[PDB]
Amino acid sequence: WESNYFGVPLTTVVTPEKPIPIFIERCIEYIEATGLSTEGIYRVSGNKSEMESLQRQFDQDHNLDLAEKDFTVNTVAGAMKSFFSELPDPLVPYNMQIDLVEAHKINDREQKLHALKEVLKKFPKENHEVFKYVISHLNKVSHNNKVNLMTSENLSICFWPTLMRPDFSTMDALTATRTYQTIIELFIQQCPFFFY
């Protein structure tokens, strides 16, 4: 199917005054109100038909109310990720990724985090805002890990491919895996240091 909202550049669906895509707001706000206790949220994949549906229905009118529509929490979670994997360019731009990976080389933890926050300063503002929003949301989901089982480590495992889209004819898949996973885990766990 075709869309004016999904699969289009990030700037097309955000303004500097309302920087978070409305679809992302709906899903995250609904997931926070409905799914913070669901085991494996974001890790479990949902009905692909139900997501395509949710996206299509939202495409029709942007005031869609997920409450009045009886969607699985996993369906809304998966549909939220889908928006990001459908973006023409990954939320975390490739150029920033290079710098992110470099900073990560620094072994001392405090040093490493400063290095990382430095790259974080160079993000395009449109992305930095959405990244901030998503990451804090994930930080919150992680605060209920005893119940929902999704520690910050787990959450990056579900998210780093989606947010970064690494090209694996450019690095060893296993090593690139540990590297991206940890980077996102740090952004999630050290959310306050990176974003407060």
From Swiss-Prot:
In brain, phosphorylated by FYN and SRC. It comes from the Eukaryota. It is found in: Cytoplasm, Cytoskeleton, Cilium basal body; Cytoplasm; Nucleus; Cell membrane. The record marks R43 as: Arginine finger. Residues 8-195 form the Rho-GAP domain. Detected in neutrophils (at protein level). N-terminal part (1-266) has GTPase activity. Required for proper cellular localization. Interacts with RASA1. Interacts with the general transcription factor GTF2I, the interaction sequesters GTF2I in the cytoplasm. Rho GTPase-activating protein (GAP). Binds several acidic phospholipids which inhibits the Rho GAP activity to promote the Rac GAP activity. This binding is inhibited by phosphorylation by PRKCA. Involved in cell differentiation as well as cell adhesion and migration, plays an important role in retinal tissue morphogenesis, neural tube fusion, midline fusion of the cerebral hemispheres and mammary gland branching morphogenesis. Transduces signals from p21-ras to the nucleus, acting via the ras GTPase-activating protein (GAP). This is Rho GTPase-activating protein 35. The lineage of its organism: Eukaryota, Metazoa, Chordata, Craniata, Vertebrata. The gene is ARHGAP35. The chain holds residues 1242 to 1437 of 1499 of the full protein.
